[PDB]
Amino acid sequence: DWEIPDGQITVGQRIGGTVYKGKWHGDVAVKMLNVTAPTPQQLQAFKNEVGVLRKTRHVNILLFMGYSTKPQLAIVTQWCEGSSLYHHLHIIETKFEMIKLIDIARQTAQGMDYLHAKSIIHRDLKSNNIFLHEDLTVKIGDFGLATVKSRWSGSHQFEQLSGSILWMAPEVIRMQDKNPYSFQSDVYAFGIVLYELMTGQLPYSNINNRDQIIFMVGRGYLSPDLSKVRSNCPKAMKRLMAECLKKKRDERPLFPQILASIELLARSLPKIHRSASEPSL
Amino acid sequence: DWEIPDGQITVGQRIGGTVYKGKWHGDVAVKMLNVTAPTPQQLQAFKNEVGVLRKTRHVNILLFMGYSTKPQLAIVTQWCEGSSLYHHLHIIETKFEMIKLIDIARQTAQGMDYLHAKSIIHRDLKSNNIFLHEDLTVKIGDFGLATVKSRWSGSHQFEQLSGSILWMAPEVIRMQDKNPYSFQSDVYAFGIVLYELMTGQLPYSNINNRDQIIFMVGRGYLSPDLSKVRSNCPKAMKRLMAECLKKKRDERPLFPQILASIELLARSLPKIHRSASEPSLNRAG
Amino acid sequence: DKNELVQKAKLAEQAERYDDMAACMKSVTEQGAELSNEERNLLSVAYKNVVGARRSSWRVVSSIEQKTEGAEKKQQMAREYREKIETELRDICNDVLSLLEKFLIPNASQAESKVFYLKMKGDYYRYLAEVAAGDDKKGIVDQSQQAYQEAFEISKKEMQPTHPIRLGLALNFSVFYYEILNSPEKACSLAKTAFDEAIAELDTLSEESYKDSTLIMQLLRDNLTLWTS
Amino acid sequence: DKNELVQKAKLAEQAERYDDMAACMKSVTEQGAELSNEERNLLSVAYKNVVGARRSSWRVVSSIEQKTEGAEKKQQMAREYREKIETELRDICNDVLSLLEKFLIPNASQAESKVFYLKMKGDYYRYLAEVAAGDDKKGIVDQSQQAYQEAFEISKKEMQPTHPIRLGLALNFSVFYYEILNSPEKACSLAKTAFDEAIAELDTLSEESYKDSTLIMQLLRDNLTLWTS
C-alpha cells in the first residue's frame, strides 16, 4: 500500500490541481488539492489518478511515490531537476542537436508505448508534461486526465471536455462519440510534440483566437503547417510527424510502429559535424 | 500485476542467481535462475524477492520493472550505465572529491532510510550492490536476501547464513538469536561502506584467511582500523563511521539519525562553489 | 545615423563581436539624445560582455598570482599581466561611467531609466572596486554604494517589487554588500526582503517581463543559500 | 630568454589569451634556433586558436552577407565587416607563413618536423584560400596543394601509417580536396586509404600517441560518412 501516513510530508515552494516542492525521504513533488471539502467528483478524480500511476514503473514515466489523504488529497512523485520540454523549446530556446531531438522523440515514444501496453490513455500529453530530467531522460508526467480503457462501452458515462487545444485531435475536439479518446488521440498529441521538436514553435502562431482554433481544427479547415520544420529535420521524421497528425485517426501509427520507425530513423541516420578538418590535440 | 508474458524479454550478454543484459522496452537487467527444476525453496526465494521489490519506488532503489516465470524464473529491473561503487573504489580507483564521497554516503543513506521506513531489511548491502548510475545517482540493488520484518517472533525458523563477510555485523556472524538481522545490521554494513569511501580500501587487508576473519570478528577481536581514513575525511564522518560500526548493535544510529547527521556533515563542510554576479539579465533576445 | 549605428550594433552582437558592438552604442549615446530602451539594453549588453571578458581574465591570473607565492619569477610575471589586464578593465569602466555621468543619467526622464542607469553606475564602480587596492579603493566603494543607494530609494518608491529592474538592483546591491563590503548579514537581509516582497505581489508580474523577474528571484534565493553556507 | 618566452606562453595559454600566447612563440621562433617539439606544439596551438577565432567570425558574417541579398544596406554593412575580418585573417596567415618559410621549414632537421611544418603550410594557405576571391585564389590554392603534397610524400616514405602526424596530414589534405578543390571522390579515397592503412598496422601505435591517432582515425571516418551523404 502507498498511503503515506500524515505528518511525514513537508510541503514547501509552489510551481503551478496545484503543485508544490516538498520533502519526504528526499526532494519530492507534491500535487495536493486546495479544496477543504473534496466533492465526490474530485474524489473519484484522485482515486482514478492514483489508480493509473500505481500501474507504472518505467524510466520514462515520472515516478509515482505515494499518496496522502489526511491534510489534503495529494499525490507524491519523484522531484525533477531540470526543465520541461516546453521550457527548453519555447522559453530558453535550448539549441539541441538533431540527434538529441530525435532521442527525445524516441524516449517520449518509449514511455507512451509502455502506457498503451498496459491500456492507459494519457489524454493530456504535451510539451509541458514531458520533463528532461537531469537534461538526459524524458519523464512523462501529469496523469490527471489519464484513464484505463474499459472493456465495456457503457461505462464511459459523461465527462466535460478539458485539455490544451493545441494538442487535441480533431475527433476529440468534435467530441461526437461517447468516447473519442483512443491510443490514436495520444499519438496525435505526440504528433504536435514532434512539431515543436522539429520546428521550434507551437502550431498556429498566426492565430490567437482560441475559439477559432477549436472550430477550425475540429472542422478540418486548420492543421499544422509542416513547411515550418527546420531544414536539418530528417525526411523520415517529417513523414512520421505528418503520419501522427493524420485527421482520420485510424490512419495514425501506434507506438510500437512509432518506435519501429524512430527506432530505424536514428539507426540509418547521419549525425556528423561537417567541418571536422583537424582539431588541436 | 507485474508478470511479463513470455517471449517479450530478449536475454543478451552476461555479467555475473545469474544476471544478463536483456531487452524489454529498452535496455533492462535480467536476473533469471538457471535451474530448470525450481525447488520450492528457490521458489519462495523468488516470491519473496519480488514481494520486496514491489514495495519500492524511490530514486535510490534500483527500479524493479517486472518478473517472468514461464521460460525461467527471472526478475527484470532498469539497466544501469556506469559502474558499481565497488568498481569505482577498488578497480578503477576513481578520484572522487570529498564532497562527492559525502554525497554518495548521503544518497546510500537515503535509499536505506526509505527501505527501513517500509520495514525492509536488505541484508546484503555492500559496495557491489551500490551503483553510481550515470555517475550521478546511487541506486541500491540486489534484493536477493531482502526480507520484511514479521510482527511475530514465530516465522524466523531456520535460514543458513549467507552473505559477504566483510560487511557482516558481529551479531550476524555469531548467529546466536533466532533472528540476528535488524535495521542495525544494515547500518553496520553501511558502516563498512563508509570505510571504503573514507579510506579507499576494504577492511582487514593484512588478513587473507577467510575463516579467521569470521572467527575474529564474531569474537570481538577484530574490527576495522579507523586510522586508515584519508586525511581529508571530515571529523564528523570518521565519528559517524565509528558509530555505525559499534559492536553493540543498539549503540548504532539508524538512518534518519544517519541522514540527519550526514545532512549536517555537508552543511558546514569545506567546499568551493559560489558565484551569481549581476547575472547579466540580458533582457534582449 | 543613429539607426545605422544601432543596426550595425545588432550585427556586431550576432557575430559575437562585443567590442565593435560597444563602439556603435557608444557613439549612439554620444549623439547626446535619450536612448530608447532597446538602445539602452544594447549598450548594457555590449559593455557587460566587454568588461566581463576582462573580469574573468583578471580572476584567472589573480589566482595564478596567489598560487605562485614565490615562485617569485612566475609571480612577477603573473602580477605584470594582471596589471596589464587591470588597465584594460579600468579604461572600460571609466568609459562607461563617463557615458553615465555625461549623457545617460542626466537625460533619464522616467524613474525606471534613472534606477537602470544608477544601478549600472553602482555596477561599474563595483567592477572598479573588485580590482582597486589601497588609496583609490574607499572612494570607489563609496561611489558604488551611493549609486546603488539612490537607485534603491527610487525603485522602492516608484516600481513594483516584481519589476525585473528593481529585483536586479536588489540582486546587485546585495552582491555589493557581500563581496565588496564583506557584510553578509546585510547582504542576506537585502536579498531576503527583495525576494519576499516580490512573492507578496505576484499579481504585479506582466506577460512580457515575467521571465526575467522569475529568473532574478531564483538568483536572489541562490545567493542567499550560498551566503548562509 | 627562450625559456622565459616559453614559460609566459604557457601562462598565456592557461589564461586563454592566445594572441599573447602567439606573440611569445613568435619571438621564440625568431630567435632563429630549431624549435623543440613542446615549443612547436605551443606555436601551433596559439596560431590555430588565433586564426580560428577569425575564421569562425568570417563564416558568421559571410553567412549574414548571403542571407541579406539586398537588403542592400545590411549587405553592404555585412560585406564591410567581412572584409575587415578578412584582413585580420590574412595578416595572421602571412605572419605564420613567413615564420614557416624563414625559420621552421629551413631548420627542420628530422622527417617528422618537415611533414609537420609542410602540413602547417598547407593549412595556412588553405585558410587563405577559404577566403580568397578571383586572381589571388589559384596561386593560393596551388601553394596549399604543393605543401600538402610534399608533406604527404615524405610522410608515406618516413612515418608509420598510424603516426598522428601522418594521419592528421591525410585528414587535412583530404579536407583540402573536398572543401577547396571541390573533388569529393579524391577526398574520399585519400581519407579511406589513410584509415585502412592505419587499421592494417595497429601494432605501430605507441603508448604516448595512441590517443591522438585513434581520435584522428575517427575524424577520418566521420568526414567520409559526411561526404558520402
UniProtKB/Swiss-Prot annotation, chain B:
It comes from the Eukaryota. Changing R57H: Loss of MAP2K1-mediated-BRAF-KSR1 dimerization. The active site is at D124 (proton acceptor). Brain and testis. It is found in: Nucleus; Cytoplasm; Cell membrane. There is a cross-link at K126 (Glycyl lysine isopeptide (Lys-Gly) (interchain with G-Cter in ubiquitin)). Changing G144R: In a colorectal adenocarcinoma sample; somatic mutation. Residues 9-265 form the Protein kinase domain. Changing V148E: In CRC; also found in sarcoma, metastatic melanoma, ovarian serous carcinoma, pilocytic astrocytoma; somatic mutation; most common mutation; constitutive and elevated kinase activity; efficiently induces cell transformation; suppression of mutation in melanoma causes growth arrest and promotes apoptosis; loss of regulation by PMRT5. Methylation at Arg-219 decreases stability and kinase activity. The modification Phosphoserine is found at S277. Changing G16V: In a colorectal cancer cell line; elevated kinase activity; efficiently induces cell transformation. The modification Omega-N-methylarginine is found at R219. ATP binds at K31. Changing G17V: In a colorectal adenocarcinoma sample; somatic mutation. Belongs to the protein kinase superfamily. TKL Ser/Thr protein kinase family. RAF subfamily. Monomer. Homodimer. Heterodimerizes with RAF1, and the heterodimer possesses a highly increased kinase activity compared to the respective homodimers or monomers. Heterodimerization is mitogen-regulated and enhanced by 14-3-3 proteins. Heterodimerizes (via N-terminus) with KSR1 (via N-terminus) or KSR2 (via N-terminus) in a MAP2K1-dependent manner. Interacts with MAP2K1 and MAP2K2. Found in a complex with at least BRAF, HRAS, MAP2K1, MAPK3 and RGS14. It is linked to Defects in BRAF are found in a wide range of cancers. Colorectal cancer: A complex disease characterized by malignant lesions arising from the inner wall of the large intestine (the colon) and the rectum. Genetic alterations are often associated with progression from premalignant lesion (adenoma) to invasive adenocarcinoma. Risk factors for cancer of the colon and rectum include colon polyps, long-standing ulcerative colitis, and genetic family history. Protein kinase involved in the transduction of mitogenic signals from the cell membrane to the nucleus. Phosphorylates MAP2K1, and thereby activates the MAP kinase signal transduction pathway. Phosphorylates PFKFB2. May play a role in the postsynaptic responses of hippocampal neurons. This is Serine/threonine-protein kinase B-raf. It comes from Homo sapiens (Human). The gene is BRAF. The chain holds residues 449 to 737 of 766 of the full protein.
From Swiss-Prot, chains C, D:
PROSITE patterns: 1433_1, 1433_2. One of its GO terms (cellular component) is cytosol. Keywords: Acetylation, Cytoplasm, Host-virus interaction, Phosphoprotein. Changing S183A: On DNA damage, loss of MAPK8-mediated phosphorylation. Loss of binding ABL1. Attenuates ABL1-mediated apoptosis. No loss of interaction with BAX under stress conditions. Inhibits translocation of BAX to mitochondria. InterPro entries: 14-3-3 (IPR000308), 14-3-3_CS (IPR023409), 14-3-3_dom_sf (IPR036815), 14-3-3_domain (IPR023410). It is found in: Cytoplasm; Melanosome. Changing S57E: Loss of homodimerization. Reduced dimerization with YWHAE. Significantly reduced interaction with P53. No enhancement of P53 transcriptional activity. The keyword Phosphoprotein applies. The delta, brain-specific form differs from the zeta form in being phosphorylated. Phosphorylation on Ser-183 by MAPK8; promotes dissociation of BAX and translocation of BAX to mitochondria. Phosphorylated on Ser-57 by PKA and protein kinase C delta type catalytic subunit in a sphingosine-dependent fashion. Phosphorylation on Ser-57 by PKA; disrupts homodimerization and heterodimerization with YHAE and TP53. The modification Phosphoserine is found at S57, S183, S206, S209. The modification N6-acetyllysine is found at K2, K67. GO terms for molecular function: cadherin binding; DNA-binding transcription factor binding; identical protein binding; phosphoserine residue binding; protein domain specific binding; protein kinase binding; protein phosphatase binding; protein sequestering activity. The record marks R55, R126 as: Interaction with phosphoserine on interacting protein. Belongs to the 14-3-3 family. Adapter protein implicated in the regulation of a large spectrum of both general and specialized signaling pathways. Binds to a large number of partners, usually by recognition of a phosphoserine or phosphothreonine motif. Binding generally results in the modulation of the activity of the binding partner. Promotes cytosolic retention and inactivation of TFEB transcription factor by binding to phosphorylated TFEB. Induces ARHGEF7 activity on RAC1 as well as lamellipodia and membrane ruffle formation. In neurons, regulates spine maturation through the modulation of ARHGEF7 activity. Interacts with CDK16 and BSPRY. Interacts with WEE1 (C-terminal). Interacts with SAMSN1. Interacts with MLF1 (phosphorylated form); the interaction retains it in the cytoplasm. Interacts with Thr-phosphorylated ITGB2. Interacts with BCL2L11. Homodimer. Heterodimerizes with YWHAE. Homo- and heterodimerization is inhibited by phosphorylation on Ser-57. Interacts with FOXO4, NOXA1, SSH1 and ARHGEF2. Interacts with Pseudomonas aeruginosa exoS (unphosphorylated form). Interacts with BAX; the interaction occurs in the cytoplasm. This is 14-3-3 protein zeta/delta. It comes from Homo sapiens (Human).
